[PDB]
Amino acid sequence: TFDMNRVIDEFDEMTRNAHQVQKQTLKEILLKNQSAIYLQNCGLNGNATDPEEAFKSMVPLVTDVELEPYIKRMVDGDTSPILTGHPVPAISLSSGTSQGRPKFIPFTDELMENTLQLFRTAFAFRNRDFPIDDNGKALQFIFSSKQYISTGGVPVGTATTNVYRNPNFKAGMKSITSPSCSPDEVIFSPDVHQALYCHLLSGILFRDQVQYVFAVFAHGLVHAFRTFEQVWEEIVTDIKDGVLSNRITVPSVRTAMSKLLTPNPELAETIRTKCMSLSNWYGLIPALFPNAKYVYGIMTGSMEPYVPKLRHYAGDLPLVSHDYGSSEGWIAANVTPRLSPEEATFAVIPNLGYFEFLPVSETGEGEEKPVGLTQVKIGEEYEVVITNYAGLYRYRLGDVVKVIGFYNNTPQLKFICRRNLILSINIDKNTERDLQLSVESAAKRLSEEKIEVIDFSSYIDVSTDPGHYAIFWEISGETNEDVLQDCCNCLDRAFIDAGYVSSRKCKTIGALELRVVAKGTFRKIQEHFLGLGSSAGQFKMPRCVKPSNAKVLQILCENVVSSYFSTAF
Amino acid sequence: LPILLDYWPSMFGMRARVALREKGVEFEYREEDFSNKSPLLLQSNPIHKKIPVLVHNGKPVCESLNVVQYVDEAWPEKNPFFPSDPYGRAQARFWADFVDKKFTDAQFKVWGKKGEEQEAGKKEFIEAVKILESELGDKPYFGGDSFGYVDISLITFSSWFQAYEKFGNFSIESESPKLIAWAKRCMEKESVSKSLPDSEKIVAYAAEYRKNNL
Amino acid sequence: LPILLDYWPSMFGMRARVALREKGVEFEYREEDFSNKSPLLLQSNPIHKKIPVLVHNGKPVCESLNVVQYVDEAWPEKNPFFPSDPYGRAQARFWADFVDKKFTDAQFKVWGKKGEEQEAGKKEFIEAVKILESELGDKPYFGGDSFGYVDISLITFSSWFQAYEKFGNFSIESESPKLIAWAKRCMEKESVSKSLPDSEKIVAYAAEYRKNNL
Ligand SMILES: N[C@@H](CCC(=O)N[C@@H](CS)C(=O)NCC(=O)O)C(=O)O
Ligand SMILES: N[C@@H](CCC(=O)N[C@@H](CS)C(=O)NCC(=O)O)C(=O)O
Ligand SMILES: CC/C=C\C[C@H]1C(=O)CC[C@@H]1CC(=O)O
Ligand SMILES: CC(C)C[C@H](N)C(=O)O
């Protein structure tokens, strides 16, 4: 049960207990999982009285390539347990690549627990700094409308979908958020670009009680608002006649929205008046719900360029930087949210995992060995290595972060990070160029509609005979299928290489499937990633999914706003 | 500086713009109000009064396919649309003539007329896109091993494909896919990717045309 | 030897014959029965099944004007049909398009029709011959300093001049002596003195056509 003072006190006690709870986090992870086969090869059994020392002297650091076959083993019909343990209820993907290729990680109910608490805690310190009305609401551009099922019959998933469609999500978040404007089915609408418009419209619906505007990211926010600049007159029309735009085709959201609609002409006079009154839409956000106390989102790292466009939108409204973690392990809360984005820092919550740091202090890089978290050095930058319930045990995520200070005894983290970048050579390609060129070729049938392609992805399905390619697309508007069908053909026609030519012309690799997905999917991916625990080197999204990639994958299937197999061929 | 007399939905004006931009000319476009055909246009073709019209050396160059061969011959050093043999040239010209007859009239029928006229036009264009699909066979383009003469000739019809799909209430793609398929392939050329206006608008122009004449 | 599929009263087929003969190319003449089209006509043109069609190097070329350009491009060594410049080949193409359509449509209403279509047709033909006389400015030929492209395009309508003189009841010569006599110059050439059948035969033929279809 969420309250302000007790949780912050316990959080104070806890951050001050940083060593014990960290050490205990280690013990707990391993108590739960003394059985890991990874660990068998390492010599573990638990207990003893040199545990921490034994773990750190006996267990080698690991990369995405090496963790790939094992969680892959878990996901594909070998429903089996491995690097963590339990076949997990879901699996993630990780930005940057595993040699150009897919990265799999386990999701457990622990990951849901950390989730509520960090936000339990987060909202508490922020509402400590930005107190909300206990009867108002929030404009949250959040989505987890999609849920794919892996080929072994096992769920593999995003942080969003798995949290939002989690059984404990609704009851758990009931007390620590202002109630969502959107009915869950539209949030979970098989069409989230249309649902996004419905979301624009939903948060817009209860503005006067609305206490914050939220996206995980500033870029998410700005995406919403440039779109706002595009569609406000249409929204006026839709909401006005009590009849929704012909833009909207999926019946359950249409069903829910008709439940929301009756004809109301006066207010249009209002919105039109205010909206045309602005100077280049500056300060749009306080214009919509003028008593929102904040704009909330991740403001650091590769999102720093999106803080300003958003600031333009935010006007003089304060920007509060969001905390930092993902399914791969939670890292740190901002408990002083009143701090500006440029100075925003996030302090580590210690039972979320057992975390260690490799110093770059020598040159670049530096053959120094990992030292503890309160053993880390102020002002210096270290790489995060993660041990938690997410499949990570002493795992190199590949990201560099800086110590600005300590809140009591737990250290304060800063990100000036962006790409976790080096790469290696692939096989979800059909080169980066070939795939990218491909979307380019196909997307211009859409360009004819005054729309540009925002983002794209892909996938190898080998449950099917023959197996098939799935191309995923993020565009700026609803359209017809015919052009999208057309597009899929071009995705196929853009793969200029002779090889692909052999199979699909013969047909021993099946017709590519274009499953068009809805707005914000790749936004779901960026938002989950930069927030992901390590250091904002977290944004080069892998472009085609081998069976071993997941975070994009849960998000794969359910918002097929349409999905097709080439009627050519 | 080449002056082009053009019309936003002219598939033919588009033949001109695509041709020129395919080559390497920087040129100016002037939009026509065919209710008020220009002093320079009425001097370019005082009887047809039709576009596209490219003006070079103060010499009016008229008719779309005429204008694109003009494109070839006015800058003969970089991007040829024909191949080297005379027979290949006659094949490409052959097929450009193909683009211009039963193909153009049939689309004219599918978005311009209805009923007894419509289905005639509908089976005509499916037939056309089928002989088309047959001769495309495999080639990335049409008139050479690269972006060709008639590539320019028939690519420009692929923004009206939306128009045809809707009033026809068809889908010209499950009957002959490699065609539209080749089209969004040809859209990657900066020659057509900046010369051709939006198809919802093109759709809407045929909608205006239809609403006028029912 | 190149193989021409043709039709003896066809003006367009005469255009082809004219081109090869103006050159010096030795070719074999073939008459097609549209009632009983030969295997090669069917195997060269699966779609239009129309004449003329020349088989050369085992590759088929169809349409008369295509042919002529095919003939110029394959034999560019002795008597060139087009000017060297882009802009003159331009005008020639422009004017080759003019006689093939409006002049051929108008003429089509003259010999093949009755009543109002024939009267309006008469007006169209004399206006069009008036324009041809005007563009000609007053040139001896059309397409180059010697016998040219659009001369070749138009000259085969001179074998039908007589049929237009009879059915349209007009003298294209008292109104434009320059075009008929443009033809009567060009008639001194074996390309026209051996390609265009007697105008008597075309007159009896077209009159026969008007007997067959009502
Ligand atoms: N084959 C011609 C067709 C051109 C044509 O018919 N253009 C029409 C546009 S539909 C035009 O300019 N009409 C003049 C007018 O509408 O007054 C070309 O490619 O230029
Ligand atoms: N573009 C062709 C079309 C000509 C055309 O229709 N020619 C007549 C010969 S006089 C023809 O072949 N008609 C075929 C038929 O009667 O079905 C050309 O100019 O040669
Ligand atoms: C523990 C937080 C779980 C919910 C987190 C998600 C949000 O609702 C904002 C982003 C955040 C992800 C992040 O902090 O990395
Ligand atoms: C945990 C979620 C609510 C948000 C998370 N950053 C994601 O996009 O997956």
From Swiss-Prot, chain A:
<protein>
    <recommendedName>
        <fullName>Jasmonoyl--L-amino acid synthetase JAR1</fullName>
        <ecNumber>6.3.2.52</ecNumber>
    </recommendedName>
</protein>
<keyword id="KW-0547">Nucleotide-binding</keyword>
<dbReference type="Pfam" id="PF23571">
    <property type="entry name" value="GH3_M"/>
</dbReference>
<dbReference type="GO" id="GO:0016597">
    <property type="term" value="F:amino acid binding"/>
</dbReference>
<feature type="binding site">
    <location>
        <position position="162"/>
    </location>
    <ligand>
        <name>ATP</name>
    </ligand>
</feature>
<comment type="subunit">
    <text>Interacts with GSTU20/FIP1 under continuous far red (cFR) light; this binding increases its activity and determines the priority of substrate binding.</text>
</comment>
<keyword id="KW-0175">Coiled coil</keyword>
<keyword id="KW-0399">Innate immunity</keyword>
<dbReference type="GO" id="GO:0080123">
    <property type="term" value="F:jasmonoyl-L-amino acid ligase activity"/>
</dbReference>
<feature type="binding site">
    <location>
        <position position="92"/>
    </location>
    <ligand>
        <name>ATP</name>
    </ligand>
</feature>
<dbReference type="InterPro" id="IPR004993">
    <property type="entry name" value="GH3"/>
</dbReference>
<dbReference type="InterPro" id="IPR055378">
    <property type="entry name" value="GH3_C"/>
</dbReference>
<feature type="binding site">
    <location>
        <position position="112"/>
    </location>
    <ligand>
        <name>ATP</name>
    </ligand>
</feature>
<comment type="similarity">
    <text>Belongs to the IAA-amido conjugating enzyme family.</text>
</comment>
<feature type="binding site">
    <location>
        <begin position="322"/>
        <end position="325"/>
    </location>
    <ligand>
        <name>jasmonate</name>
    </ligand>
</feature>
<dbReference type="Pfam" id="PF23572">
    <property type="entry name" value="GH3_C"/>
</dbReference>
<dbReference type="GO" id="GO:0071365">
    <property type="term" value="P:cellular response to auxin stimulus"/>
</dbReference>
<dbReference type="GO" id="GO:0005737">
    <property type="term" value="C:cytoplasm"/>
</dbReference>
<dbReference type="InterPro" id="IPR055377">
    <property type="entry name" value="GH3_M"/>
</dbReference>
<feature type="binding site">
    <location>
        <position position="95"/>
    </location>
    <ligand>
        <name>jasmonate</name>
    </ligand>
</feature>
<comment type="function">
    <text>Catalyzes the synthesis of jasmonates-amino acid conjugates by adenylation; can use Ile and, in vitro at least, Val, Leu and Phe as conjugating amino acids on jasmonic acid (JA) and 9,10-dihydro-JA substrates, and to a lower extent, on 3-oxo-2-(2Z-pentenyl)-cyclopentane-1-butyric acid (OPC-4) and 12-hydroxy-JA (12-OH-JA). Can synthesize adenosine 5-tetraphosphate in vitro.</text>
</comment>
<feature type="binding site">
    <location>
        <begin position="524"/>
        <end position="528"/>
    </location>
    <ligand>
        <name>an L-alpha-amino acid</name>
    </ligand>
</feature>
Swiss-Prot record, chains B, C:
<feature type="domain" description="GST N-terminal">
    <location>
        <begin position="1"/>
        <end position="79"/>
    </location>
</feature>
<dbReference type="GO" id="GO:0048046">
    <property type="term" value="C:apoplast"/>
</dbReference>
<dbReference type="GO" id="GO:0005739">
    <property type="term" value="C:mitochondrion"/>
</dbReference>
<dbReference type="InterPro" id="IPR045073">
    <property type="entry name" value="Omega/Tau-like"/>
</dbReference>
<feature type="domain" description="GST C-terminal">
    <location>
        <begin position="85"/>
        <end position="205"/>
    </location>
</feature>
<dbReference type="InterPro" id="IPR010987">
    <property type="entry name" value="Glutathione-S-Trfase_C-like"/>
</dbReference>
<dbReference type="GO" id="GO:0009407">
    <property type="term" value="P:toxin catabolic process"/>
</dbReference>
<keyword id="KW-0963">Cytoplasm</keyword>
<dbReference type="GO" id="GO:0009629">
    <property type="term" value="P:response to gravity"/>
</dbReference>
<dbReference type="GO" id="GO:2000030">
    <property type="term" value="P:regulation of response to red or far red light"/>
</dbReference>
<feature type="binding site">
    <location>
        <position position="64"/>
    </location>
    <ligand>
        <name>glutathione</name>
    </ligand>
</feature>
<feature type="binding site">
    <location>
        <position position="10"/>
    </location>
    <ligand>
        <name>glutathione</name>
    </ligand>
</feature>
<dbReference type="InterPro" id="IPR040079">
    <property type="entry name" value="Glutathione_S-Trfase"/>
</dbReference>
<dbReference type="GO" id="GO:0019899">
    <property type="term" value="F:enzyme binding"/>
</dbReference>
<feature type="binding site">
    <location>
        <position position="51"/>
    </location>
    <ligand>
        <name>glutathione</name>
    </ligand>
</feature>
<dbReference type="GO" id="GO:0004364">
    <property type="term" value="F:glutathione transferase activity"/>
</dbReference>
<dbReference type="InterPro" id="IPR036249">
    <property type="entry name" value="Thioredoxin-like_sf"/>
</dbReference>
<keyword id="KW-0216">Detoxification</keyword>
<protein>
    <recommendedName>
        <fullName>Glutathione S-transferase U20</fullName>
        <ecNumber>2.5.1.18</ecNumber>
    </recommendedName>
</protein>
<comment type="function">
    <text>Exhibits glutathione-dependent thiol transferase activities. Can use glutathione (GSH) and 1-chloro-2,4-dinitrobenzene (CDNB) as substrates. Involved in the regulation of far-red light influence on development. Regulator of the interplay between light and JA signaling by increasing JAR1/FIN219 efficiency. Maybe involved in gravitropic signal transduction.</text>
</comment>
<dbReference type="GO" id="GO:0005829">
    <property type="term" value="C:cytosol"/>
</dbReference>
<dbReference type="Pfam" id="PF13410">
    <property type="entry name" value="GST_C_2"/>
</dbReference>
